[PDB]
Amino acid sequence: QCQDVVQDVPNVDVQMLELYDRMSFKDIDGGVWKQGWNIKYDPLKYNAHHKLKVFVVPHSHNDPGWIQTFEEYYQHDTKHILSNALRHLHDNPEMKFIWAEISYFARFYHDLGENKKLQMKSIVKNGQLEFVTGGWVMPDEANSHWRNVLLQLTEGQTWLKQFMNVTPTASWAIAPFGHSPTMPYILQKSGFKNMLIQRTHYSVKKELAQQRQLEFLWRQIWDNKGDTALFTHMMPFYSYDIPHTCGPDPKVCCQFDFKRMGSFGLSCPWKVPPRTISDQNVAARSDLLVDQWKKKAELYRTNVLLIPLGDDFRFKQNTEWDVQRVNYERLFEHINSQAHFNVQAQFGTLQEYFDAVHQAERAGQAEFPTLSGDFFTYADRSDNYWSGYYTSRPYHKRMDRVLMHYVRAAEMLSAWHSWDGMARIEERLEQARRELSLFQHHDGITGTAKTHVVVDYEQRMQEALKACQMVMQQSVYRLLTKPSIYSPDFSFSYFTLDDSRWPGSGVEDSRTTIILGEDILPSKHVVMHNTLPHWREQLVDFYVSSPFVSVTDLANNPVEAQVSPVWSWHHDTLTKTIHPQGSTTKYRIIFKARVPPMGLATYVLTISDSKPEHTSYASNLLLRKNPTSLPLGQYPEDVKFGDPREISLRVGNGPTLAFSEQGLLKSIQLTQDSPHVPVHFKFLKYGVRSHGDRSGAYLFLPNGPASPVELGQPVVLVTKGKLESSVSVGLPSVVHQTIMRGGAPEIRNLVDIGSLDNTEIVMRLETHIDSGDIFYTDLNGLQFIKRRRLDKLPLQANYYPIPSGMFIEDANTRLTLLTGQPLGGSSLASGELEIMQDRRLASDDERGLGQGVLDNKPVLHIYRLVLEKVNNCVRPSKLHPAGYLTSAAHKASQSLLDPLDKFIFAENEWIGAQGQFGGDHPSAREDLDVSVMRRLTKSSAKTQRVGYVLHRTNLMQCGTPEEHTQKLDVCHLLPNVARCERTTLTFLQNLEHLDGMVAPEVCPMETAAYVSSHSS
């Protein structure tokens, strides 16, 4: 019996949307704890029979790229930190240290000699060095897709299991800029028992501290029973550095950071330095320190206190290890010996802290509150909300989503077979997983790194894309060639990938033309891959060197096709207009590909001397005053011209779209009879303040509501075809395109902010929909959370991450915008949606980056726009904190994130070609996905193992019967199954041995992992 994720509102002690509605968010001076209050404690609370247990946990925050590249930091800092940790921990058995970033640890460990590897394993086994989380990175939680959060977690933990024989069950996330419930969701399904967070809004820290609700059982917003709950510790103060981790007064705590006495080039901003601990000062020093600890302890419910001891790239110098250790040892010896303190203090690890907290809990000493919700948008002080990084460096945010899909497709396509080592499949896939995993870092996908570091991430991701292409095309060639003919050269390109949306038209001329001709080559095979576990039809397009091309399947059945020109937009620096030019030698052919679940389908493109029977030609209409001619070579339809005017289009029996004379949507009519529902696209601009704090890579600090972009009299191009129609317009900084293929439109924006300094370009949708102050945005592509616009907070506080979609609705109507890239957005007034496209900022925003954002480059953003009637849908109650997509919106999101892959055969003739793969694969219910298929064993293993991650979303019931689908049992996808086991999501622990070797499908909103074992 599945939990109902719609109709049962969970009863939790703290529900973050409710808390937000009630809180005042006043920013008052609290004294030494600037954002809190003067903490008081009863000195008699602790006595001989009830002592305060203090764990001082040394740590070093190591960014895998930020102000330097990964490799620069490794050479200049991290390799020294790890080498000196090994020495100092070895030599000082009571000293402890925690480590989070496995990318660096793997980088270090593989360069060690065997003697040192053994010493390292010994300090891990004995518990002195403890891994926390164990992901490749400490990821961003706002822009990251859940699939990539899982990918990087798995990459780090798989390394740790293999080399260190440990799997962390406690997570440490001190640095991401706000926190998502997607983390406890994944962690709890990956064996975790505890997690720690830090960067939450200062007003939230104060509110929860006042109620001693900083430790809580964090469950998902829809979880009525609580089975998703994960114990979470929120740190109370402004920073994770030493001045903000000993207690509420940083002027005091800074005196206990022994790296700040002068020789290290560090000091205390509060103007009182640390002093070396001696017998003559230890009593006074201890009195000050214990007083800070007892104040911090007032904020929590047990007698066990966590004191982190660290900062960025700490514990480098041998002298630094000594200065911190020897001074703390003198403090501990004094404090622990003076009964009047009633304290036992020691170095500890994160797990030791949590174990002691839960021991106290079981002793009946505390009960913990339940909580649901998220912790966006973060503000660290005053009105400084960190909503800028939801958009910064949008080219690379888009690249993340492209690479996400290519990693999935490469792992899936190659999983079907075992490969010889000489094929280098495992090598290429490990590289691709690791570069994508690295980019999940909270300075990677966030767009908060220095320019040269962004370039490094981009180069790494480009290499990863090439690796995925190589693995994919080798796999296609194996899956579709007669086995007794197959003769692979593992270095050769049998196919090249054709991608219509990355980097994109107008971004890079990267696509190959299929060159056909009577005197060269009459025809070409192309292959589509469908990574989703259901049959899919989708229009696909290729560039071809003639308009006279027709399409067949590999039974030689004709397939209806449409040919259109190849249009490119040019900023004519002579005429000062932006206008399209057509190619006279290449054309686009478009046709519907029908592809099996997790399968492949082959088609053939053939040239003829004249218009083929089954190919039609789009009309083209250029709307502008003072047109000039647009010749198109052999294209059989002449371009038409007109003055700008409103126009309407309808493809198939789908919606009718109306456009303004400037080429922007104005209305959607769902059916023949229905109203033309106002739905109006508009581009606006935000600026930057001329006084006070400046927007930068992290912060969005607008100088008021956005102002309309002045459009002039833009050139509009209308292409009308039987299969696909479009309206494209060259606006200042944006070539905006609305594409119609018979269902929800697709929007593409080619965004080039050029040299517009101190500008943020936003795309807004204006409707009539009576949404009031409510809107919905997603978290990590996993779930939709209810948002309430709060006029008591500034504009930038009402911006949230849009990692994959957002919607507004009233009783009758919903408008959903799905995205192919994470961007920031909001609903700033009833009936509106808006999403930021790019931002160019001249100033640094005082968070450590030390530059503006002046490295913008053209990016092609993609979207789907779904207007729907929802009066018949079974929706959650008004008090439920979640929302859910319809079938059409979810399919539209899948169309953006996991499109069909397209392969063009490279050579002239493909001997032994086959027409299809996977025609016998089950076509699963629309709400179920095989998020991951990964072969886990190399070819030398007697018993092959294949891992699957299944995810089931939850779609609204709206009265569409949508019938008969087949059960998907992933354990029988490969033959000769000998065992099927449910595992943690990282595949690292077996949870259940499955009867009949059958992997059951999962419940709505659940994710499960299975591993099948095969004897042949």
Ligand X SMILES: CO[C@@H]1O[C@H](CO[C@H]2O[C@H](CS)[C@@H](O)[C@H](O)[C@@H]2O)[C@@H](O)[C@H](O[C@H]2O[C@H](CO)[C@@H](O)[C@H](O)[C@@H]2O)[C@@H]1O
Binding site for ligand X (CB under 6 A): 61, 63, 66, 175, 266, 311-314, 442-443, 448, 847-848
Give 243 or 599: the residue with its C-beta nearer to ligand X: 243
Least distance (Å) between residue 105 CB and Zn ion:
16
Whole-angstrom distance, CA of residue 842 vs CA of residue 388: 14
DSSP helix/strand/coil, 873: coil
**Closest to 749 in 3D by CA, of 636, 840, 665:** 665
478, interface contact from ligand X, Zn ion, none, CB < 5-8 Å by kind: none
Instruction: Give me the half-sphere count of Cα atoms (radius 13 Å) on the Cβ side of residue 92.
Output: 19
Least distance (Å) between residue 376 CB and Zn ion:
18
Residues that bind Zn ion (CB under 5 A): 63, 175
Least distance (Å) between residue 269 CB and ligand X:
8
Whole-angstrom distance, CA of residue 643 vs CA of residue 714: 11
Least distance (Å) between residue 192 CB and Zn ion:
21
Residue 17 contacts residue 373 (beta carbons within 8 Å): yes
Handedness of CA 564, 569, 575, 576 (dihedral sign): positive
Least distance (Å) between residue 175 CB and Zn ion:
4
Give 296 or 441: the residue with its C-beta nearer to Zn ion: 441
Give 139 or 883: the residue with its C-beta nearer to ligand X: 139
Give 175 or 744: the residue with its C-beta nearer to Zn ion: 175
143, interface contact from Zn ion, ligand X, none, CB < 5-8 Å by kind: none
Residue 453 contacts residue 65 (beta carbons within 8 Å): yes
Least distance (Å) between residue 259 CB and ligand X:
7
Residue 305 contacts residue 215 (beta carbons within 8 Å): no
847, interface contact from Zn ion, ligand X, none, CB < 5-8 Å by kind: ligand X
Least distance (Å) between residue 313 CB and ligand X:
6
171, interface contact from Zn ion, ligand X, none, CB < 5-8 Å by kind: none
Give 105 or 222: the residue with its C-beta nearer to ligand X: 105
Least distance (Å) between residue 135 CB and ligand X:
15
First-last CA distance in the chain: 36
Give 201 or 685: the residue with its C-beta nearer to ligand X: 201
Helix 79-91 × helix 102-109 angle, to 10°: 80
685, interface contact from ligand X, Zn ion, none, CB < 5-8 Å by kind: none
Give the DSSP H/E element, type plus range, for residue 413: helix 394-415
Q: Which residue is nearest to ligand X (CB)?
A: 848
Whole-angstrom distance, CA of residue 29 vs CA of residue 26: 10
Instruction: Give me the half-sphere count of Cα atoms (radius 13 Å) on the Cβ side of residue 774.
Output: 20
DSSP helix/strand/coil, 126: coil
Is the peptide bond prior to 377 cis by the omega test (within 30 degrees of 0)?
Answer: yes
Least distance (Å) between residue 501 CB and Zn ion:
32
82, interface contact from ligand X, Zn ion, none, CB < 5-8 Å by kind: none
Least distance (Å) between residue 180 CB and Zn ion:
17
Give 66 or 347: the residue with its C-beta nearer to ligand X: 66
The residues near 218 (Cβ < 8 Å, ≥ 6 apart) are 181, 184, 195, 229, 230, 231, 232, 371, 372
768, interface contact from Zn ion, ligand X, none, CB < 5-8 Å by kind: none
Whole-angstrom distance, CA of residue 655 vs CA of residue 659: 13
- The CA–CA distances, whole Å, from 313 to 74, 317, 328 equal 10, 10, 20
333, interface contact from Zn ion, ligand X, none, CB < 5-8 Å by kind: none
Q: What's the token pair of residue 568?
A: 């490119």
Whole-angstrom distance, CA of residue 248 vs CA of residue 163: 40
Give 103 or 228: the residue with its C-beta nearer to ligand X: 103
Give 67 or 1002: the residue with its C-beta nearer to Zn ion: 67
Residue 944 contacts residue 929 (beta carbons within 8 Å): no
Give 66 or 256: the residue with its C-beta nearer to ligand X: 66
Computed on alpha carbons and rounded to an integer, the radius of gyration of the chain in Å comes to: 30
Give 249 or 456: the residue with its C-beta nearer to Zn ion: 456
Least distance (Å) between residue 198 CB and Zn ion:
11
Whole-angstrom distance, CA of residue 374 vs CA of residue 671: 39
848, interface contact from Zn ion, ligand X, none, CB < 5-8 Å by kind: ligand X
109, interface contact from Zn ion, ligand X, none, CB < 5-8 Å by kind: none
**What DSSP string describes 270-301?**
TS-------TTTHHHHHHHHHHHHHHHHTTSS
Least distance (Å) between residue 848 CB and ligand X:
2
Residue 785 contacts residue 869 (beta carbons within 8 Å): no
311, interface contact from Zn ion, ligand X, none, CB < 5-8 Å by kind: ligand X
The residues near 87 (Cβ < 8 Å, ≥ 6 apart) are 318
Least distance (Å) between residue 128 CB and Zn ion:
24
448, interface contact from ligand X, Zn ion, none, CB < 5-8 Å by kind: ligand X
313, interface contact from Zn ion, ligand X, none, CB < 5-8 Å by kind: ligand X
Q: Which residue has the tokens 């020093």?
A: 285
Residue 930 contacts residue 948 (beta carbons within 8 Å): yes
Give 239 or 346: the residue with its C-beta nearer to ligand X: 239
Give 25 or 177: the residue with its C-beta nearer to Zn ion: 177
926, interface contact from ligand X, Zn ion, none, CB < 5-8 Å by kind: none
**Closest to 1011 in 3D by CA, of 943, 941, 920:** 943
As beta bridge partners, residue 739 has 726, 746
Give 175 or 415: the residue with its C-beta nearer to Zn ion: 175
Q: What is the DSSP letter of 966?
A: P
Least distance (Å) between residue 803 CB and ligand X:
19
Whole-angstrom distance, CA of residue 278 vs CA of residue 501: 66
